[PDB]
Amino acid sequence: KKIFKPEELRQALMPTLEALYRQDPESLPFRQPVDPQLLGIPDYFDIVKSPMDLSTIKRKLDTGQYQEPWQYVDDIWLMFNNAWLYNRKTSRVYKYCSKLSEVFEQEIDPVMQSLGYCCGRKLEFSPQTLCCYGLCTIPRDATYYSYQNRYHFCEKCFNEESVSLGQTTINKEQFSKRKNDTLDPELFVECTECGRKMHQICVLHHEIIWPAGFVCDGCLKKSARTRKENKFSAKRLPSTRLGTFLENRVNDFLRRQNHPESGEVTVRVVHASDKTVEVKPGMKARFVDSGEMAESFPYRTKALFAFEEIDGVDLCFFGMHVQEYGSDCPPPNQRRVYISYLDSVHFFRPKCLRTAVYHEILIGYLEYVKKLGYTTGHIWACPPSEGDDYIFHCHPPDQKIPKPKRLQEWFKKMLDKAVSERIVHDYKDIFKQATEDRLTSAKELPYFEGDFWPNVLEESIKESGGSGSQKLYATMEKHKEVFFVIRLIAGPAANSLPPIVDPDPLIPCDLMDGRDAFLTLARDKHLEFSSLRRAQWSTMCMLVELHTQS
Ligand SMILES: C/C=C/C(=O)SCCNC(=O)CCNC(=O)[C@@H](O)C(C)(C)COP(=O)(O)OP(=O)(O)OC[C@H]1O[C@@H](n2cnc3c(N)ncnc32)[C@H](O)[C@@H]1OP(=O)(O)O
Ligand SMILES: [Zn+2]
Ligand SMILES: [Zn+2]
Ligand SMILES: [Zn+2]
Ligand SMILES: [Zn+2]
């Protein structure tokens, strides 16, 4: 419907082109088509297959060759990328190009908005971090070697003449040499009325939620219409006793604070299933085969998430998975909870209450399981490894990751509040707790899925040639600050408790059975949590998936 008259485009866009022209000397290298012979650059057309320059763009603009402004934008960016491709990162033309692109970004955005568009930005997704086979990492722009887009090797790892994969043998000549410089553009959706192309993420159009098609805000307002209601919301996910309890605690806290521009928080439990952790081969040979320790321990895993409405749209800002070992579970795991992992995306409003809200969620959770008859909570204060994510794929680059001391103090501050509220009786590091329990053997340590202690015990038994317990106190002392043991129910009352009965039903949801599936989904579908807009999109997609798979 909306056809842009060539004078309309010229009038609107020419000032953005002049802005580049008037950059001296930066503009000069880009004003005329590259003559490779005259400049003395022979291989230019071996690399650059679609040459572009300011004159060519000016001409297309003067002669009405563009039907819509993104075509102008694409040519501008082609010119820039041609120069960034051909010239060295350290060169003159490269840095000049970079300067022009900055001028362009600033110029183009408000112009495109004047023409009825979401924005004028050039948007591309973050490059994924590439592993090796033999646990190292390949960074962005570093040359590397790959086979079947599956087996990749860092350049140093490669030069040492046939590779083993899995176990078949592949000559080095069969590998691709390439740079990790590939970035996927953001996708557009077309307004079904005016025909304008908008960033799908800018407008948050999801085809399942609005199957009749995308209609831009401009077109809606002209006829005083509004979008059909999004029924795939966080609020409409099924309620649980636990979720309700946590969200009530949070919102009651927020109401007491009465900070300006506070929003309601929604907490939902999205997975609950029964699982078992098996004792690993070292500990099994040592204690299971002689009948001193159970071969495996049953637990219930749960996943829960907190959401806030920001700018009218759902935003998932906190996630946590827990392991719950009930009253039927054998010692040493009986009546214990362990936090598998928690994660957050730092967009909560108001900022000044963010930490407080996370603490309320954790304190609430401890309070809840205490009420059910769980006696003891367990936390391993372990920051994610460099450039890894616990739950949310691709964090904002300006969200800092706490180092261990800061994270330890954060847990201590939470627990101190829990103690002052008479929820937590007390808490101790693992070394002090073992001392208090008069622990003598490794078989007496709680044994959790994915935890530090099962792995270090394997290593210890093998290193010592058969002892599980020799250096155990020394190992606990050495790592003590990182391991919290939290007494919810103390003393004689902990010995005569009734069975634990959880009133909430099981909740099958394969997507949220541990962290891996949602990380995989997010990676495969470009669901990043790296900016407010991308997190809002990713939340919207996550919620559709949660609503439709169940
Ligand atoms: C076995 C499994 C165990 C676990 O999962 S334990 C939990 C581990 N999880 C994670 O760490 C997941 C990712 N982290 C989170 O989501 C974590 O934030 C989190 C989920 C705590 C939440 O942390 P908070 O936002 O409540 O607090 P932080 O310590 O992250 O940040 C507070 C503060 O410290 C600053 N900070 C944080 N790190 C640093 C550094 N490094 N240097 C300097 N300053 C720093 C940060 O910028 C902030 O500054 P201001 O708001 O501007 O005052
Ligand atoms: Zn946009
Ligand atoms: Zn390597
Ligand atoms: Zn429209
Ligand atoms: Zn404030």
Side-chain angles (χ1 to χ4, degrees), residues 118-119 199 202:
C118 56
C119 72
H199 291 114
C202 283

Side-chain angles (χ1 to χ4, degrees), residues 274-307:
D274 289 321
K275 306 195 78 170
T276 51
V277 57
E278 288 172 19
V279 176
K280 292 175 195 279
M283 281 281 294
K284 179 186 187 300
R286 182 63 186 79
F287 295 116
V288 178
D289 297 342
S290 76
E292 293 170 52
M293 191 178 188
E295 183 174 44
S296 62
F297 301 91
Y299 65 98
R300 193 160 284 188
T301 188
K302 299 177 169 189
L304 61 89
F305 286 94
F307 301 85

